[PDB]
Amino acid sequence: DDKDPMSAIKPDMRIKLRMEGNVNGHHFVIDGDGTGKPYEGKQTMDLEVKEGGPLPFAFDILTTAFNRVFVKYPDNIQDYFKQSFPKGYSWERSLTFEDGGICNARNDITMEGDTFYNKVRFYGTNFPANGPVMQKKTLKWEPSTEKMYVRDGVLTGDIEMALLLEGNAHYRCDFRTTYKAKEKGVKLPGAHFVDHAIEILSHDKDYNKVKLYEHAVAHSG
Numbered sequence: 001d002d003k004d005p006m007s008a009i010k011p012d013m014r015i016k017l018r019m020e021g022n023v024n025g026h027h028f029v030i031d032g033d034g035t036g037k038p039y040e041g042k043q044t045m046d047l048e049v050k051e052g053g054p055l056p057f058a059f060d061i062l063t064t065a066f067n068r069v070f071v072k073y074p075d076n077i078q079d080y081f082k083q084s085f086p087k088g089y090s091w092e093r094s095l096t097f098e099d100g101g102i103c104n105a106r107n108d109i110t111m112e113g114d115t116f117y118n119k120v121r122f123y124g125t126n127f128p129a130n131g132p133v134m135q136k137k138t139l140k141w142e143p144s145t146e147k148m149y150v151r152d153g154v155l156t157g158d159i160e161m162a163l164l165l166e167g168n169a170h171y172r173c174d175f176r177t178t179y180k181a182k183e184k185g186v187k188l189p190g191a192h193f194v195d196h197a198i199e200i201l202s203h204d205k206d207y208n209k210v211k212l213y214e215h216a217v218a219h220s221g
Contacts, residue, residue, distance in 0.1 A: 008085040009038050009069065014115040015045055017066060023103070023124035024134065028052030032066055032118065034212070038082065041072030041217050044201070047210040054206035057127065060138040060163055063198055063212055065093070065105040065122050068179065071194055071216045078189035079218075080148075080155055084181040085111045093177040101127035132165050139164040143197035146175070148218075150188050155179040157194070192220045 017032025029051035036043025045066055049055060068091075073079040081089060088110040095103035103124035110117045127133045146159040156178050163171040196216035203210045 006039075008111065009082045010114055011039055012037055012114075015043065015067070015118070016115055017045070017118035017120060019062065019065065019120040019122055021122035021124075022052075023055075023057050023061070023122070024127050026052055026056050028055060030062070030066075032120075036070045038069050039072065041070055042215050043067070043070040043213070045212045047212055049208045053208045056134065056136075057124075058133045058136050058138040058163075059200070059203070059207040059210060060141060061095070061103065061124065061133055062122055063141065063200065063210075064095075064161075064175070065107060065120050066212055067107070067109055067116060067118065068194070068216070069109075069116070070214065071196075071218050073218045077192050077218055077220060078187060080179060080181065080186060080189045083186050084109075084183070087111075087182045089179060089181040091177050091179045093175060095124075095173050095175055097127075097133070097173045098171065099128055099131050101125070101131065101133060132163070132169075132171050137166045138171060139166065140200070141198050142170075143195070146177075146194040146196060147191075148189065148194060149191040151178075153188075155188055190220075192218055194218050 015034045019030040030049050032045050032047055034045030068081040090108045093105040105122045108119040142162040146157045148157050159175045161173045165171050194216055198214045201211040201213050
């Protein structure tokens with residue numbers, strides 16, 4: 001062990017992002033600019049809708065597609081994401097909501113110097129016209145625990161999410177993310193959990209500009 005552990009992943013990195021896709025036929029393009037500390041499991045991002053604004057659907061369904069490199073991994077758990085760089089990795093995610101709405105998100109994450117670049121694509125469909133997503137009745141994603149494990153040789157993360165709605169109601173969704181490193185020799189980690197909390201710090205009236213924050217910590221049992 002004579003190599004620099006932070007030779008690729010610096011304690012303070014920048015994040016550049018561009019999201020492209022549509023939800024129920026409404027195309028949009030959102031840019032992302034923020035920083036974060038990977039070893040502390042924190043990241044902040046200033047978002048701006050460049051096309052398709054104002055979004056006719058809830059902005060909360062997109063926040064989780066706006067990088068597990070910002071996870072505070074203990075020394076007894078293999079960090080599959082921090083060992084994915086400088087080359088990077090990518091993930092594919094499916095979001096299955098309780099009223100039939102289904103989304104497919106993916107992000108190709110590369111590293112150029114001190115900046116994380118993200119090529120995000122978000123495609124949602126089957127959302128009911130009177131549902132809380134199209135009617136914009138959501139408030140926040142509840143903090144929740146993602147479970148990491150190896151499924152058929154690929155690092156998989158399932159979690160049961162929940163969106164707080166207006167009127168003391170909840171709107172649940174089931175996530176399934178597959179994380180693949182571009183170097184196919186990166187050692188897969190063991191089964192562990194990732195407690196995370198995502199929230200919108202500030203936003204304008206039409207959600208054209210959003211300041212997003214996320215905090216995540218990894219642990220086992």
